[PDB]
Write a protein that binds this ligand. Structure first.
Ligand SMILES: Nc1ncnc2c1ncn2[C@@H]1O[C@H](COP(=O)(O)OP(=O)(O)OP(O)(O)=S)[C@@H](O)[C@H]1O
Ligand SMILES: Nc1ncnc2c1ncn2[C@@H]1O[C@H](COP(=O)(O)OP(=O)(O)OP(O)(O)=S)[C@@H](O)[C@H]1O
Ligand SMILES: Nc1ncnc2c1ncn2[C@@H]1O[C@H](COP(=O)(O)OP(=O)(O)OP(O)(O)=S)[C@@H](O)[C@H]1O
Ligand SMILES: Nc1ncnc2c1ncn2[C@@H]1O[C@H](COP(=O)(O)OP(=O)(O)OP(O)(O)=S)[C@@H](O)[C@H]1O
Ligand SMILES: Nc1ncnc2c1ncn2[C@@H]1O[C@H](COP(=O)(O)OP(=O)(O)O)[C@@H](O)[C@H]1O
Ligand SMILES: [Mg+2]
Ligand SMILES: [Mg+2]
Ligand SMILES: [Mg+2]
Ligand SMILES: [Mg+2]
Lengths: 448, 346, 312, 304, 316
């Protein structure tokens, strides 16, 4: 029998113990469950909010989490997608009179249950002229509400959302680890009668960046290719080989190796060129180091071409980049890859840099008495000395940690969130923070 | 206490007293011009600027706030900026908007000009728009700055707080009074340290203050922080204290020492990890290059120092042209390894 | 009064010169009602907006010319596509039977999204509205869009072809042109009849006579003798006295370093070098040009150029 | 009002030392105007005097610069808007910094509007302007005033405004801003606010003009003359800690290298490195590293 | 009025698409079983994306193609209001199709939709996936926001090898009986650069303008710098003969070929050339550097001459 349903809908998390991402003690779905179950006490340390803000990368389970949470506690929700106009007038004419009202689902059910909630999905889509004034009216509704509003975003570091997070319990979905998704998708592929080697599964989960919807669509396409009877890692491994590509490859082929996924190939090459042993340099480290420096020079030339292509959309320099970042290093490093074409790992470092950047910028803005520098190391050294200032009273005497922490926290207009930010921000080399090196911290969070 | 003993009046400054009297005479005469104040970091540009504002407007220039404005790119990539503002001025850093620095300048100058049209009567007939870190503005943005600086000349004055004006277009240098704030001398740093400790009532000796000054390298903020940080650890001040240095200074130093120790790719990978740990903490790549180059030059030979200096200059130049700084940093390191090993071995 | 660039416009299709193949093919297209979408590209002043206007006036009448021809410039503004162009291409004209014509001058200033929209508009209405795009850089046009239409490269006019038209203009008017004033006009024009006629008219109207000196002074073009002098200072003098001489000449007349550098390149290729020295001169001059493109001091770049020539 | 405009010429044949431009500017009623010359030589002053003579004090000319950040389209659009004394005058400053493609478009805009608006292109190089625009225009060179005249006018200004400056102070004021009367007057103005009229010594001029003192340049050459790399590091660190921009160091170092008795090979090498360092600084490279590199090259050139 | 060959010979079923055997094989599987996912077909122009989506939609629906398919080009209004009204009312609309068939919403030129439109399209894609399937096409697959790629299979398309374009060109020639010659076919394949629609357009234009197909005639309608001149110039640069390569360079500059075009052809010819390998790479490096400097805006003949001087001094 033909199936009229995708895998994304056949194997959706029909229950709450099936969300692949978070099945722990205090995870994005259990924290939300506990915030909702005792929301009535509002009208985790999030019981003081009137709305949640589930934010994170795509395809991780935000929509499913909110629906299943509101569905387990017997709540009944009104979803407002981005495909529903949400301008100020439309929003305050559709959902204004429903916030402080009783739902008719609370009387007439086909059991009967009160506790109606609202779900404002894709809140960062409330941009443009169509949804003019959506976020302002939304925070104005959150301020005066009597039912739990559950907003879902996609990037908390957004200008429009930054004025909203101040009113919402801030949850943050993490990309699920590869082992969790691996177990889940292996069980699914077993249900489906599709046999895939676990290495290929790890390849699929990594290439899709741990996006469960994308890995499910990729498994569907895989099974499609299987019934019909070249990925990033494969081409990244094919550029540093010797023995089989002597006559098989020419300049056109080596240049084409770049064009398979030209948006990610240079990153793969720059990451994996260092684990090669140049056949041309037969163990002579003096030549192996020289080949490494020449390959690095070529990769920087590729970066120059890339930064030139990005500014003005001039797609005529793509072959030049393919020569500088993918073919050249190939001829320079043409030995034998040691272990495996690991992921580029530059995107994660750039995201973490953006996080540390905005964290330091916020912490420094609160220190705007008469001194400020936006995000420089000027503030990184004020904040290293502030971390050594704070931890000193408590390192040396348990009785003065509170007095000094408060005196400084209020002299420079800092909060507990600011304390947490300043602690695990100056940990170089994975060194533990000088705050975990006991009994006073428990009363420290409770008495502050 | 870095923000606890910085002066607030031009007559209260600790060093460059002739320049202080000159600035006081300037703000006393009519028609305050556009100021371009520059000089090495940590020399007192912001202190002098705040003193100029205290002499210009009332003391109400200290009761400031923090406004968060949103700008719109020539597309839907919205950006949010932070403007520290008072009742008479506005301090914005129009460079966090990476390449959208041309619109923030226009819009902020417009908004300040229109707000001054709303009954600015306190003591002056103009407002101040303090733009910090100007030398990192894009040329398309400095041209907009030049245009909107005269377009609203009558109602708002600009104070550009940059350093090493080398990357400021001459069209701007020709429309701003150039105030130059050199780094204070070693003796000036020693005297301000002794003054701060005496107002604190401490026992700062004469041989520790000089070590603090020589290590701070003419940077007053670094010296004050080092003095404050050698107190949080060992109050009694002796002649041989182990005065601390920031975390990233140590990291960058041990990274350079690691590059010097081994010359193997397995070492180059660890150096790549260290460069990532440095970049991730948001320290500029130019600072990384200068700090790496110094500790490297301490471990080379006089005949090799020329090549290494030129290599650092070349790589750093190229890094200011590309997008991913780690590529050029790792290239510089790899090249220095391939050169240093060939020199030491041979 | 009336400029000569308009008085001597080719009114018919045969009064065009130097494009006999393209003109014959377009005329054959007209005769057989097989006129495809046209893409006319090439350097300025070569006869594109005149070719298509003659073709139009041959195709429609003079009263149908307001309701069946949309002459639209693309440098004024994606909205222009779905706006007037889509509303012009999709609708018939009431009583006239036949296709329409849309002439997009400067068709390369269009963003790529606008060219996608326009390519779909073209693909849809291709039997009641023929598009004629006109550009200078075919490389700026999306390969998709250009695929749709037949391309015609209107290259520059060789000086043999364009001299007879200038001679006819001279005889019809009264211009006492020297035997080399024509040469120094053809050279400075660089193969666009518009600039040639404009320079000729403006000089004849300003000074009253055209010769090899008058045109060089009317256009402010650096004279050949001056660049020879500069090359002699660089090649047969001391460094400092060459710097002094070149700076004095560069400030005496209005002269930048781009123009000095271009003419000096042409001279490096003119005069005889050991052919391993001009590889150095050429490399260094091509680096000095890039250095000047980023907004640097010209006092240090001029000295760099003299340093380049001091290989001798 | 600033002194750069308070002491502008009010007429055409009044004070402008250039004679062949003030005679033709009377018949200016060759449709357009084209002035070129070194900066601060009365380029805009002369046309403003001509426009106040022709139009009148209340009849008030759109002046905008062609080096805008907002592209060329907004320039010609503004010209069209201004288009609608049988004509109006539009002034284009820095008209040489327009790329050839942007001058082609300005050419179309100014030749389609060649009935109601007269143009004036002000530049420093007539060769940078393409042949159509120059061929349509009438050129006028503006040569700087003689050194003695400069000092004369500056003394006149200092006596009209009561600014007690030594005569050697005026000589150094005109020397520090070479042949730039506008820059010299602006420096004289903004250097008396800095003193309140008590006394304007040459140190105030050296600070306002941004000129690094010749002592530091001699120290740089003394270090790179013969010495280890440590001396170069020390002198460059001291020069950066003083605030002096690297552009000025490169400029003055070049000025010293060119007109001294170094060999032709040494001058060639040092000046090539100076040009490369100047481009590197203009590209946003770090001043300390570029100065270290330049000093290393100069040292390996002189010490050998 | 006869319609062009780009349409008269458009393949009407996926067995006639010569583009990418693996992806077209996947799509034939989908046209057989019948439960397609939302697919984003991305690739260079002229390679058969619109054709593949159209043939897939036809083979799926059949005679209900007028009732179950909604196509929205780039020439159609596709703002947030259209995405919120027309596309949504079509997704909700009831059409009764066979067991595994679904309605199809073909958004051609998906990279031309503003971000707001795609944000408004997300949940429409997600909710009605039980009866509505989306088939987007694009060239720049990064102009599509990430949440839209998260709910689509991103099928990649690549340029066509010369053999495939040659097979299809011969299939068309056989039907049209156009007199040809091998040099003409090689000229068309050189001027095509993979675009299978460019090749057909050049073939038809050449045949309609002149008839017989020979390289001399192909380069009379395309008219780009003849690759023989560029081969000769690169050859002179290999022998370190600057004065003979600048000859050809100034000849090309005399005919008004824009330097971007000259560099494009020099690159495309120096890539598939007959030098050594290390020397070829040392040449391609310099040609790439000069291409960067010309795209940046420094497009004078002096830069081309400097490139020739560097190419010469690479071989001493
Ligand atoms: N944690 C998860 N466990 C199981 N299935 C998941 C999980 N996350 C996503 N999925 C699958 O992916 C589909 C879509 O997930 P959603 O929760 O809708 O993604 P999302 O968080 O809404 O992403 P957006 O809305 O684009 S930011 C579901 O129908 C599931 O099949
Ligand atoms: N082949 C030609 N025969 C006769 N006159 C010509 C020819 N080419 C140019 N001209 C003259 O030059 C003038 C300008 O030619 P145009 O056709 O306008 O050039 P153009 O291609 O439109 O240049 P653009 O639009 O700036 S790219 C016309 O008015 C003619 O007088
Ligand atoms: N020849 C002159 N005759 C009269 N006044 C002059 C002369 N040269 C300079 N000046 C004076 O110097 C001042 C500046 O002249 P400007 O016309 O502004 O120079 P400039 O051409 O504008 O230089 P720019 O704008 O920086 S390129 C005016 O206030 C004049 O009083
Ligand atoms: N792979 C192919 N096999 C056969 N014919 C093809 C192929 N690709 C293109 N064609 C022909 O080219 C014509 C146009 O191709 P399209 O399907 O429009 O390509 P396209 O992917 O839409 O290109 P775009 O939309 O400009 S990016 C079709 O009518 C076919 O005749
Ligand atoms: N005249 C002064 N007296 C005492 N301390 C000063 C003085 N000038 C600067 N400082 C110190 O430097 C700190 C900040 O330096 P700042 O004025 O910001 O210079 P920069 O802007 O170059 O960093 C002040 O908090 C103060 O500690
Ligand atoms: Mg969702
Ligand atoms: Mg035209
Ligand atoms: Mg002027
Ligand atoms: Mg298509």
């Amino acid at each position: 029998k033909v199936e009229n349903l995708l895998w994304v809908d056949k194997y959706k998390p029909t229950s709450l113990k099936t969300i692949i991402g978070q099945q722990g003690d205090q995870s994005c779905a259990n924290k939300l469950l506990r915030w909702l179950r005792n929301w009535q006490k509002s009208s985790d340390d999030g019981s003081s909010f009137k709305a949640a803000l589930l934010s994170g990368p795509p395809g991780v389970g935000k929509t499913t989490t909110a629906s299943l949470v509101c569905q387990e506690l017997g709540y009944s929700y009104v979803e407002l997608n981005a495909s529903d106009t949400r301008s100020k007038s439309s929003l305050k004419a559709i959902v204004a009179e429903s916030l402080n009202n009783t739902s008719i689902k609370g009387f007439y059910s086909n059991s009967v249950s009160t506790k109606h909630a609202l779900i404002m999905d894709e809140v960062d889509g409330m941009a443009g002229n169509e949804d003019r004034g959506g976020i302002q009216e939304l925070i104005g509704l959150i301020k005066h509400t009597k039912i739990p509003i559950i907003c879902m975003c996609n990037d908390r570091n957004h200008p429009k959302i930054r004025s909203l997070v101040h009113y919402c319990f801030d949850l943050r979905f993490q990309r699920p680890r590869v082992e969790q998704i691996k177990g889940a998708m292996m069980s699914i592929a077993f249900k489906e009668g599709l046999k895939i080697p676990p290495p290929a599964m790890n390849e699929i989960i990594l290439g899709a960046n741990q996006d469960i919807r994308q890995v499910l669509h990729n498994l569907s396409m895989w099974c499609a290719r299987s019934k019909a009877l070249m990925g990033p890692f494969d081409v990244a491994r094919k550029v540093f080989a010797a023995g089989e590509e002597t006559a098989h490859m020419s300049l056109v082929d080596k240049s084409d190796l770049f064009f398979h996924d030209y948006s990610i190939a240079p990153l793969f090459v720059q990451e994996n060129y260092i684990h090669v042993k140049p056949v041309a340099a037969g163990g002579d480290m003096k030549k192996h180091l020289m080949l490494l420096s020449r390959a690095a020079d070529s990769i920087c030339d590729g970066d120059l071409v890339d930064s030139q292509i990005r500014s003005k959309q001039n797609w005529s320099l793509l072959p030049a980049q393919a020569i500088y970042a993918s073919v050249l290093p190939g001829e320079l490093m043409r030995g034998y890859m040691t272990q495996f074409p690991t992921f580029p790992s530059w995107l994660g470092k750039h995201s973490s840099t953006g996080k540390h950047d905005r964290i330091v910028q916020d912490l420094a803005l609160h220190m705007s008495l008469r001194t400020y520098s936006s995000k420089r190391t000027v503030n990184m050294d004020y904040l290293s000395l502030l971390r050594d200032a704070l931890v000193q009273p408590l390192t040396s005497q348990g009785v003065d940690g509170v007095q000094d922490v408060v005196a400084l926290m209020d002299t420079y207009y800092l909060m507990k969130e600011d304390f947490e930010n300043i602690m695990e921000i100056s940990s170089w080399g994975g060194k533990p923070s000088p705050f975990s090196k006991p009994k006073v911290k428990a009363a420290f969070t409770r008495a502050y | 206490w870095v923000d606890k003993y910085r002066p607030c009046s031009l007559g209260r400054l600790d060093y460059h007293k002739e320049q202080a009297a000159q600035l006081r005479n300037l703000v006393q005469c009519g028609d305050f011009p556009h100021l371009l104040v520059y000089g090495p970091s940590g020399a007192g540009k912001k202190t002098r600027i705040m003193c100029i504002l205290r002499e210009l407007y009332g003391v109400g220039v200290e009761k400031l706030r923090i406004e968060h404005q949103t700008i719109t790119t020539p597309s839907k990539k919205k950006i949010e900026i932070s403007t520290i503002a008072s009742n008479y001025h506005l301090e914005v850093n129009p460079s966090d908007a990476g390449n959208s620095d041309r619109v923030v300048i226009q819009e902020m100058l417009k908004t300040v000009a229109q707000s001054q049209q709303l009954e600015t009567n306190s003591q002056r007939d103009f407002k101040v728009v303090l733009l910090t870190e100007v030398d990192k503005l894009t040329k398309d943005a400095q041209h907009a700055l030049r245009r909107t600086m005269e377009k609203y000349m009558s109602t708002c004055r600009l104070i550009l707080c940059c350093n090493s004006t080398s990357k400021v277009i001459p069209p701007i240098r020709s429309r701003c009074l150039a105030v130059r704030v050199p780094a204070p001398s070693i003796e000036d740093i020693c005297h301000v340290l002794s003054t701060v400790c005496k107002k604190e009532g401490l026992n700062l000796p004469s041989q520790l203050a000089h070590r603090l000054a020589e290590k701070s390298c003419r940077n007053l903020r670094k010296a004050l922080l080092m003095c404050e940080a050698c107190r949080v650890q060992q109050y009694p001040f002796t002649a041989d204290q182990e005065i601390p240095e920031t975390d990233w200074e140590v990291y960058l130093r041990e990274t350079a020492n690691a590059i010097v120790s081994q010359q193997t790719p397995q070492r180059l990978l660890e150096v790549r990890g260290r460069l990532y740990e440095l970049l991730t903490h948001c320290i500029p790549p130019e600072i990384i290059m200068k700090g790496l180059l110094s500790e490297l030059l301490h471990n080379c030979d006089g005949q090799l120092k020329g090549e290494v200096a030129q290599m650092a200059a070349y790589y750093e130049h190229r890094l200011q042209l590309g997008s991913k700084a780690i590529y050029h940093l790792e290239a510089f390191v790899a090249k220095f390894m391939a050169l240093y090993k060939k020199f030491m071995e041979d | 009064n009336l400029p000569w660039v308009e008085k001597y416009r080719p009114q018919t299709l045969n009064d065009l010169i130097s494009h006999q193949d393209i003109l014959s093919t377009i005329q054959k297209f007209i005769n057989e009602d097989r006129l495809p979408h046209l893409l006319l590209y090439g350097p300025p002043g070569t006869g594109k907006t005149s070719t298509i206007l003659a073709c139009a006036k041959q195709l429609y009448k003079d009263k149908e010319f307001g309701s069946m021809v949309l002459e639209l410039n693309a440098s004024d503004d994606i909205d222009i596509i779905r706006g007037p162009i889509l509303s012009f291409a999709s609708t018939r004209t009431i009583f006239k039977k036949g296709f329409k014509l849309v002439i997009l001058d400067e068709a390369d200033a269009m963003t790529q999204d606008a060219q996608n929209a326009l390519r779909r508009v073209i693909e849809k209405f291709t039997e009641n509205t023929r598009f004629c795009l006109i550009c200078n850089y075919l490389s700026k046009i999306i390969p998709a869009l250009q695929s749709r239409c037949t391309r015609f490269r209107f290259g520059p006019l060789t000086p043999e072809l364009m001299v007879p038209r200038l001679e006819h203009v001279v005889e019809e008017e009264k211009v006492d042109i020297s035997e080399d004033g024509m040469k120094a006009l053809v050279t400075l024009s660089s193969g666009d009849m518009r600039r040639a006629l404009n320079i000729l008219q403006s000089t004849n109207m300003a000074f009253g006579k055209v010769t090899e000196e008058t045109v060089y002074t009317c256009t402010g073009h650096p004279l050949k003798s001056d660049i020879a002098n500069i090359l002699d200072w660089m090649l047969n003098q001391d460094f400092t006295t060459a710097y002094r001489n070149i700076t004095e000449l560069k400030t005496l007349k209005g002269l930048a370093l781009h123009d000095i550098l271009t003419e000096i390149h042409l001279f490096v290729h003119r005069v005889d070098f050991p052919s391993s020295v001009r590889i150095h001169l050429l490399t260094k001059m091509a680096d000095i040009e890039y250095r000047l493109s980023v907004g640097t001091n010209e006092k240090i770049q001029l000295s760099s150029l003299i340093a380049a020539f001091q290989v001798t | 009002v600033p002194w750069v405009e308070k002491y502008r010429p009010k007429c055409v044949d009044e004070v402008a030392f250039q004679e062949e431009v003030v005679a033709v500017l009377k018949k200016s009623l060759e449709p357009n105007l084209l002035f070129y010359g070194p900066p601060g030589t009365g380029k805009t002053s002369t046309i403003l005097a001509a426009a106040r003579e022709l139009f009148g004090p209340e009849l008030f000319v759109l002046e905008l610069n062609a080096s805008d950040e907002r592209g060329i389209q907004v320039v010609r659009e503004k010209v069209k808007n201004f288009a609608q004394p049988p004509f109006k005058i539009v002034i284009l400053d820095e008209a040489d910094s327009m790329t050839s493609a942007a001058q082609a478009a300005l050419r179309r805009t100014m030749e389609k509007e060649s009935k109601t608006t007269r143009f004036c292109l002000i530049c420093n190089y007539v060769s940078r302007i393409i042949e159509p625009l120059t061929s349509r225009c009438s050129k006028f060179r503006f040569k700087p005033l003689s050194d003695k005249i400069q000092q004369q006018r500056l003394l006149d200004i200092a006596k009209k405004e009561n600014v007690k400056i030594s005569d050697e102070g005026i000589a150094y004021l005109v020397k520090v801003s070479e042949g730039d009367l506008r820059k010299a007057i602006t420096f004289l103005q903004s250097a008396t606010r800095l003193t309140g009229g008590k006394e304007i010594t040459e140190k105030v001029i050296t600070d306002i003009a941004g000129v690094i003192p010749a002592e530091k340049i001699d120290g740089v050459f003394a270090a790179c003359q013969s010495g280890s790399f440590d001396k170069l590091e020390a002198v460059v660190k001291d020069l950066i800690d003083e605030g002096h921009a690297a552009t000025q160091l490169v400029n003055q170092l070049h000025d010293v290298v060119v007109e001294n008795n170094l060999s032709d090979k040494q001058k060639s090498i040092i000046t090539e490195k100076l040009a490369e360092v100047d481009k590197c600084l203009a590209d946003g490279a770090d001043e300390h590293l570029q100065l270290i590199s330049l000093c290393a090259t100069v040292m390996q050139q002189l010490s050998q | 009025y006869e319609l062009p060959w780009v349409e008269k010979y458009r393949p009407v079923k996926l067995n006639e698409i010569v583009g990418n055997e693996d992806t077209v094989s996947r799509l034939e599987v989908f046209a057989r079983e019948g439960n397609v996912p939302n697919i984003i077909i991305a690739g260079p122009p002229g390679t058969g994306k619109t054709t593949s989506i159209l043939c897939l939609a036809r083979a799926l629906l059949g005679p209900a193609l007028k009732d179950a398919m909604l196509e929205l080009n780039a020439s159609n209004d596709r703002g947030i209001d259209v995405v919120r009204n027309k596309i949504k009312m079509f997704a909700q609309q009831k059409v009764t199709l066979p067991k595994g068939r679904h309605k199809i919403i073909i958004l051609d030129e998906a990279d031309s939709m503003t971000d707001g439109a795609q944000q408004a399209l997300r949940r429409t894609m997600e909710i009605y996936s039980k009866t509505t399937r989306f088939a987007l096409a694009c060239n720049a697959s990064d102009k599509i926001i990430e949440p839209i790629q998260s709910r689509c299979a991103v099928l990649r398309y690549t340029k066509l090898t010369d053999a495939q374009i040659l097979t299809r060109l011969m299939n068309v020639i056989e039907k049209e009986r156009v007199p040809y010659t091998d040099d003409g076919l090689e000229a068309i394949i050189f001027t095509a650069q993979g675009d299978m629609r460019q090749a057909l357009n050049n073939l038809q234009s050449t045949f309609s303008g002149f008839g017989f197909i020979n390289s001399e005639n192909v380069f009379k309608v395309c008219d780009e710098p003849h690759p023989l001149l560029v081969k000769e110039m690169i050859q002179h640069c290999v022998n370190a003969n600057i004065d003979e390569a600048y000859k050809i360079l100034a000849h090309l500059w005399h005919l008004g070929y824009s330097p971007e075009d000259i560099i494009g052809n020099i690159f495309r010819v120096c890539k598939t050339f007959q030098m050594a390998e290390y020397l070829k790479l040392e040449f391609i490096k310099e040609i790439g550097y000069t291409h960067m400097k010309i795209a940046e805006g420094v497009n004078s003949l002096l830069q081309m001459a400097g490139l020739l001087a560097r190419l010469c001094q690479k071989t001493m």
